[PDB]
């Protein structure tokens, strides 16, 4: 890798600078370099990894949706399909890169619940982004891979974390989105969002003001989805 000659601490510092500069491709390359040093990531470092790749793939997904819409309207020369395919392939490449980092070897080395759930949630998310653009038999397998990662993360989170833990909440949020938008299971999505919200509500009394703010921010998204879905 092009980051092999840079110190781990320098890569982390530069990832933080890239975030401030809104240079998310750079941020992702720095964090990939940090992961490839082979040491586990701290909580802050895991969040930098996630912020970098969520912003990169988020831009790709937005572009893919614009192009897909144009292509479908044109289906009501080859250039629109070719360019949508170009963006799609780049998106798939970024998802494959993230999944490869998780497989080599972030998940296998993650023994604490907070790290393992975080990485399995990431694995679910990036398979979900692959599913958004997949067509056919490969779509079924990609969907099952997302479901399997989310389910393992859910099982650990329910045994090891309180219902208000922000990682647990964000996992349940994204799994509910998977059910509604990917798996054609809107009732499962609604049930998961409702149960997650209610169990978090009942645990808010245990939280400090700052943790209360962190948890309620994600609970609001569960409510926002329930309002869209019901």
């Amino acid at each position: 890798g092009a980051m092999g000659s840079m110190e781990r601490a320098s890569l982390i510092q530069k990832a933080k600078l890239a975030e401030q500069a809104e240079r998310y491709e750079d941020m992702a390359a720095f964090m990939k370099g940090a992961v490839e040093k082979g040491e586990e990531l701290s909580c802050e470092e895991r969040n930098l990894l996630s912020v970098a790749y969520k912003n990169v793939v988020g831009g790709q997904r937005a572009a893919w949706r614009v192009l897909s819409s144009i292509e479908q309207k044109s289906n009501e020369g080859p250039e629109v399909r070719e360019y949508r395919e170009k963006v799609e392939t780049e998106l798939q490449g970024v998802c494959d890169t993230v999944l490869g980092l998780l497989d080599s070897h972030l998940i296998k080395e993650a023994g604490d619940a907070e790290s393992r759930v975080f990485y399995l949630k990431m694995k679910g998310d990036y398979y979900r982004y692959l599913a958004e653009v997949a067509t056919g038999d490969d779509k079924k397998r990609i969907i099952d891979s997302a479901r399997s990662a989310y389910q393992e993360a859910m099982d650990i989170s329910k045994k090891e974390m309180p219902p208000t833990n922000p990682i647990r909440l964000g996992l349940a949020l994204n799994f509910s989105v998977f059910h509604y938008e990917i798996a054609n299971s809107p009732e499962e999505a609604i049930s998961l969002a409702k149960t997650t919200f209610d169990e978090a509500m009942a645990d808010l009394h245990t939280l400090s003001e700052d943790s209360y703010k962190d948890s309620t921010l994600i609970m609001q998204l569960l409510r926002d989805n329930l309002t869209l879905w019901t």
Binding site: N47, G170, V177, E181, W229
Partner: peptide, 8 residues
């Protein structure tokens, strides 16, 4: 579309 966890 639905709301997923914010990018950060």
């Amino acid at each position: 579309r639905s709301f997923s966890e914010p990018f950060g």
